[PDB]
Design a protein around this ligand. Sequence first.
Ligand SMILES: CC(=O)N[C@@H]1[C@@H](O)[C@H](O[C@@H]2O[C@H](CO)[C@@H](O[C@@H]3O[C@H](CO)[C@@H](O)[C@H](O)[C@H]3NC(C)=O)[C@H](O[C@H]3O[C@H](CO)[C@@H](O)[C@H](O)[C@@H]3O[C@@H]3O[C@H](CO)[C@@H](O)[C@H](O)[C@H]3NC(C)=O)[C@@H]2O)[C@@H](CO)O[C@H]1O
Length: 416
Amino acid sequence: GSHMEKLAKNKVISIDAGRKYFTLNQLKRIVDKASELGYSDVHLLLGNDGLRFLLDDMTITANGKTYASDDVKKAIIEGTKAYYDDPNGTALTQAEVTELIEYAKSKDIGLIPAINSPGHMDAMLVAMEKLGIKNPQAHFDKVSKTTMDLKNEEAMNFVKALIGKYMDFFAGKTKIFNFGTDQYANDATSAQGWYYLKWYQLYGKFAEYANTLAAMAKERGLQPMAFNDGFYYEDKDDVQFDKDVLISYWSKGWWGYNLASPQYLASKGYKFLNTNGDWYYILGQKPEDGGGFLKKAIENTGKTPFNQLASTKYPEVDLPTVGSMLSIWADRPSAEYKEEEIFELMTAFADHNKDYFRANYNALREELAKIPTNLSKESLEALDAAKTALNYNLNRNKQAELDTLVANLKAALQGL
Ligand SMILES: CC(=O)N[C@@H]1[C@@H](O)[C@H](O[C@@H]2O[C@H](CO)[C@@H](O[C@@H]3O[C@H](CO)[C@@H](O)[C@H](O)[C@H]3NC(C)=O)[C@H](O[C@H]3O[C@H](CO)[C@@H](O)[C@H](O)[C@@H]3O[C@@H]3O[C@H](CO)[C@@H](O)[C@H](O)[C@H]3NC(C)=O)[C@@H]2O)[C@@H](CO)O[C@H]1O
């Protein structure tokens, strides 16, 4: 059935935890709401401008030398603080992120980590400076502060190795790994990075870098994901890209930022994670700033259909997507993270799409945790009968249907 097909789609909440620090227990609560509302995954940006995740062993092997774990950690902490010294914290630990993956798993919530490059790597650039790698930054109208110079082999080799060590960690723990590749040297090019790459004949060198990260992910058993920006820019295929990359499509761009359409990308075989920019919320964004403020995001949650990719009209244009992603951003990371706002937008998105989202199984899990190894024939058959009649396939339209079933389990649990 199509009932099966909709629930099998991805419902993802994206948290910008690269720019701004989130506590283990803050993220823990997001995945709780995600589970309750009927989401399937939490997308967690850990490298996005700042680098807010440190492994237990951060020993990097690149350029014929090795970088001591302690030297690497110290470098990264300084870089993340150079981007933005968050008073709430710097980086999540291995032990914390492991806990979140196992916690999310217990609630049928997948995790999708994101470590961003070659753009959005302010922290890594500084970390590499501190580590002995000179001038890792891209250079156009000015020296970039966000983007790696694709011609710096020493910088490229380090980042490749560093992303490899993160990937080694998520191998076996998560299905997907997002490497981003969005908005190249936007600070240094007046938001025309792709135009500057093609102008300086470095776009092929960009695809070569992205294809590497795609292959690195595959060989480690991770589904590679990237944003759409750099893929077949301006609908040109003079430079080819890896076709197995799950495209998180957010926008077709604006004047002078001529991104590939979803149609052109789909014609080349790409499957989409619908990351429509309409559903965007930037922390502390006000209706007067324009763009992605809360009440527009909550409004577009109903105005923009679930399967509708940015720059297209549904169902007139019906392109294949594995599901949808709702994205929360921290562009000014000093803005207050108000949990209520995110929970409200998450709810709205779920409420407008009750046939895609799952019912709330949290009550059921607590009631099933109350049944013992054994505690009387006839009363034990009612316990088996209620356990049989449980339906794990119900969507958000059927909470009542589910509640009745859990109630029958609660009643049957009190026999003898
Ligand atoms: C004047 C004119 O006609 N055109 C150009 C301007 O539009 C352009 O300024 C841009 O404006 C667009 C809006 O049209 C905006 O993109 C939008 O972002 C909204 C949420 O921020 C979202 O609701 C909306 O769907 C989306 N696109 C639309 C409506 O088409 C631009 O914002 C981008 O890009 C700038 C780069 O200049 C970044 O600073 C922003 O952060 C944002 O990038 C992404 O968005 C999120 C949330 O903001 C970030 O956190 C992410 O890091 C980032 N990437 C991803 C993958 O999400 C932009 O402001 C100007 C720019 O010069 O040019 C005019 O010619």
